[PDB]
Structure formats: C-alpha cells, structure tokens
C-alpha cells in the first residue's frame, strides 16, 4: 500500500491562485481538499482512520495554516525567478509513504515546477534535484532556515504518515479487501484485417489477466490497453487482437481475476452467448 497526498497549485498572476488536494490509499481515494472549502473532506466512511475528533481537527488546522502560508510564500518567491514573476506557474506536490511488512515504511515528498520535478525533502532539509533551475538555490536556502517548518515536515514524514495510515488500513479493511467481478463482452472494428476487442469491466481489485486464446495457445499479438477507471471505483480494461477476416472463428477471450473464485470467464467469438450479446448492442454506425 502506497499512501499519497497530491497537491496541485496554480498561480496565474499576482492576484490569482488556487490550491487543490487529493489523497489516495493505493487506488481508493480517501480525501479531497477543494480550494473553496475551509476544510478537508472525507471521501470514505473510514477516512478519519483511527484518530480522535480533536486530533483530526488539530491535523486539519495545521494544514489550513499551511495552505495560506504556502500561497503567500510562493507569491514572494516568484519575485526571485530568472525572469521575475514568470506567470503562469504550476506547482505540484506529491508526499506520502509506502507501507511494507510488518511495520516497515519509506516516506517521500516530491515537488514539481511546470510539470518538472525540482525539489524534494530529504532527512532534515529541502534539496534541489539535478537539473533544477539555478534561481531555486536562494529560495531553498531561505526555506531551509525555517527549522520550525523542517521539524514539522520531519514529524509528518517519519511518524504521522505511517501511523495515520496503519489506522486507515485497519478502519478501511473491508473496502480495501473487497472483490468485484468483471463482466466481459466482445466486439470488432476494421483495421483486409479486423480488430477484435475484449471489454472487461467492473473488476476490483486492480490486477487481472486478459488474453486472446486459440484453444490453449496464448495469442502473442494481444495488446492489453490501459486500466481505465469507472465512477464506482471499479476498473475497466480492453484487450484487442488484429486478425485476417474469417479467422475470428475459434478465438476466445479468457479473463482471470481474484473475484471469480477459480472459475475464469471465457468468451468464444461466434458463440450463442456472443451472438445474443451483439443483438442487444446493434447500432447504425452514424
């Protein structure tokens, strides 16, 4: 499990900025912090982990101070730029911790400027990273004088992160360990070749295996697409295969997934199940 907090700040000009955050525990979202909201929102019933209400309110007040100070601090620091105040400015932060067994973990805090990684927090201090703009040297020196900020960040990375997260993992156990079954279906489009598509939708957790098969042979030309999210936090994936016309005959799409309890989905091209599916999904192509 990788716990990640992601902040995205946009600074258009001297008078306009916006900061938005999201928090992820593996691939489930646990928090949202919109720029228009004074407070961090829970996106799960268990998003408070094992912290008390007054403890949660203390962590939050801390971040509420951070969000205002970050904004003012950047607006000053952009005066120090190579051509001064080179708006628009995009800053991204990615902080968090990888959780391992049994209670072992590694923390990170990465910062990007214009889509480019430039700064990390490391041990006790901020560091520019190879290839960072030279004008960042003075800002980082200045920031590194703030030992109060540095003690807070160290405490967040070393202790608050892994501890908060071990409670989230306990409180969120049934959601994190949920199994949702993929449903599969077939279709085809032109490439004198055709392109066959196996659509696999609604699986959780994320790892699946989807291959085009001819009997027991794995068709090595199978191109597995990207994992695409659905709105209910299940996943969607298609696998495709380029075949000459009159060869769909005999191919199947096999799907293996933890939720299927040992019984794979196998869809044969041309099968009664496929024909009855295709009848339900006919359309005019314009």
């Amino acid at each position, epitope marked *: 499990y990788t716990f990640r907090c992601l902040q995205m700040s946009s600074f258009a000009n001297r008078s306009w900025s916006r900061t938005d955050s999201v928090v992820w525990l593996g691939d489930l979202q646990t928090h949202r912090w919109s720029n228009d909201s004074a407070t961090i929102s829970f996106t799960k019933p268990w998003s408070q982990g094992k912290l008390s209400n007054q403890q949660w309110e203390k962590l939050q007040h801390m971040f509420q*101070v951070y969000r205002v*100070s970050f904004t*003012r*601090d950047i607006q*000053e*620091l952009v*005066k*120090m730029m190579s051509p*001064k105040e080179d708006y628009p400015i995009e800053i991204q932060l990615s902080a968090g911790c990888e959780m391992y067994p049994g209670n072992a973990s590694e923390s990170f805090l990465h910062v990007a400027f214009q889509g480019k990684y430039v700064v990390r927090f490391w041990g006790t201090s901020w560091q520019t990273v190879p290839g960072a703009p030279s004008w960042l040297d*003075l800002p980082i*020196k*200045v*920031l*590194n*004088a*703030d*030992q*109060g*900020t540095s*003690a807070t960040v160290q405490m967040l990375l070393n202790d608050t992160c892994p501890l908060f997260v071990r409670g989230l993992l306990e409180a969120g156990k049934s959601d994190l360990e949920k199994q949702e079954k993929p449903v599969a279906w077939l279709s085809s489009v032109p490439s004198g070749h055709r392109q066959l598509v196996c659509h696999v939708s609604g699986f959780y957790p994320k790892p699946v295996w989807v291959m085009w098969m001819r009997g027991d042979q794995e068709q090595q030309g199978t191109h597995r697409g990207d994992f695409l999210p659905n709105a209910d936090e299940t996943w969607y994936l298609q696998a495709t295969l380029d075949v000459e016309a009159g060869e769909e005959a005999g191919l199947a799409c096999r799907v293996k997934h933890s939720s299927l309890g040992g019984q794979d989905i196998i869809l044969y091209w041309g099968s009664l199940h496929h024909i009855l599916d295709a009848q339900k999904m006919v359309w005019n192509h314009r």
Partner: T-cell receptor, first 108, second 110 residues
Framework: QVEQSPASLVLQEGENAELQCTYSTTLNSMQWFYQRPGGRLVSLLYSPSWAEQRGGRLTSSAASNESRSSLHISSSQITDSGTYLCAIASSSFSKLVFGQGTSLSVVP | AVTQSPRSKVAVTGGKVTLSCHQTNNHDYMYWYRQDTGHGLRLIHYSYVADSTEKGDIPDGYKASRPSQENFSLILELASLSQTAVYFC??????????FGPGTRLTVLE
C-alpha cells in the same frame, strides 16, 4: 498588524518590566529593538519560534494558546529608559513587520 | 556589520539625494526602511541579490539600486518635505536575523 502594549510604562529602578507584542499571523521569528530618541536602533533579542531562550536579565516568552509574546526585563535600571520596538516575521519569506513601540521610563 | 552614509543630510525640495548602505557579511537581502517619530519602521525597497530591486510597502518617491552584493543605495530624485525622516538600512543572510545600520537623519527644506 503588530500591536505593542502598553504604549508607555513608568517604573522605579529595581522593578521588573513586562512588554507585550500581539500579532495575527504565524510566528517565524520575533526581534526586539531598543532606541533612545534620535538614536540608533539597537537589537536586543532575536528569538525564532523553535529556539530555546537563553537566560539573563532580558528574556522573552510566548503566551501558550495565544498569538502573543512578551519581553521580560529583570531588575530595571535607569539606563533601560527608551523605546522598545517589536518586529515579527511570519515565515522565512515574509517581511519583518514592526509594532509602534512601547515607551519605557525607569525612574530613580 | 552594516554601515550607512552620509550619517546626516540636509537637502532642499527638488534636490537629488542618495543614501548608501554597505555590508560585507556575505548577506543576501538588503532593505531600506524609514522611521517617523514615532515609531515603527516602514519598508521602502529591498533586494535579493546583485542587480535587482524589489518594491517594499511605501516605494513612492524613491528608487533603489543594488550595484553589487555589498552595496544598496536609496535614491530620492526629487526631494519633497514629506521625506524628512530617519532612514535605516538592514541586511540578512537567507533566512535569518536582520542586522540594522546606524541610520541617517534626512531633513528636506524649502
């Protein structure tokens, strides 16, 4: 945005002085200055919010729940008479924002 | 640690006045403040590094120049009566505590 109080204080040599500085931001650092009229601005104390105070006749402390720090003068002498100015930085990037000062008169 | 010159100045309305501040602390920032009795300092201009200048809170009537790491000047191109004040230079590393110069009393007169 930085407030000092009282605006003036009179006291007898030997008495302790306490001077307040209230502010409405985060506290990176507090700097106190001493000045006689038409004189230079002399640094008395620099205290970052994370540093330990160094004991002596002149010290500072932050109020517990409150955005407020004090200057403490032990056993005031006639030569402590002058103006005391508070300045607050809110972060390592901000400006040093100055109060309007306390007039201290130590009388024999 | 921080010096200023001249120590004192009397000028006429419309005159050009230059105040100089000097430091060899290896400091990054330099500042110009004015003080009016009485008594908080107000920031006029400041600077991060050689050859750049940033406007403070009350920059109207003043220009600043940072010809090198060591030197920071405040220029009043057309002195006016409202510029009668004491001026303090200051410097700092990063980062840290501000060190102040001894001040210059300026009197602008008809």
């Amino acid at each position: 945005q930085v407030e000092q109080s009282p605006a003036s204080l009179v006291l007898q040599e030997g008495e302790n002085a306490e001077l307040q500085c209230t502010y409405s931001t985060t506290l990176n650092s507090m700097q106190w200055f001493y000045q006689r009229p038409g004189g230079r601005l002399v640094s008395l104390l620099y205290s970052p919010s994370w540093a330990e105070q160094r004991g002596g006749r002149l010290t500072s402390s932050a109020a517990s729940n409150e955005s407020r720090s004090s200057l403490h003068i032990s056993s005031s002498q006639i030569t402590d008479s002058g103006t005391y100015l508070c300045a607050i930085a809110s972060s390592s990037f901000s400006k040093l924002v100055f109060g309007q000062g306390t007039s201290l008169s130590v009388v024999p | 640690a921080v010096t200023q010159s001249p120590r004192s100045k009397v000028a006429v309305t419309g005159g050009k006045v230059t105040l100089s501040c000097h430091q060899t602390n290896n400091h990054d920032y330099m500042y110009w403040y004015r003080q009016d009795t009485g008594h908080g300092l107000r920031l006029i201009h400041y600077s991060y590094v050689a050859d750049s200048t940033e406007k403070g809170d009350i920059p109207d009537g003043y220009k600043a120049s940072r010809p090198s790491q060591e030197n920071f000047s405040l220029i009043l191109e057309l002195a006016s009566l409202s510029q009668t004040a004491v001026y303090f230079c200051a410097s700092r590393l990063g980062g840290y505590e501000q060190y102040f110069g001894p001040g210059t009393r300026l009197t602008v007169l008809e």
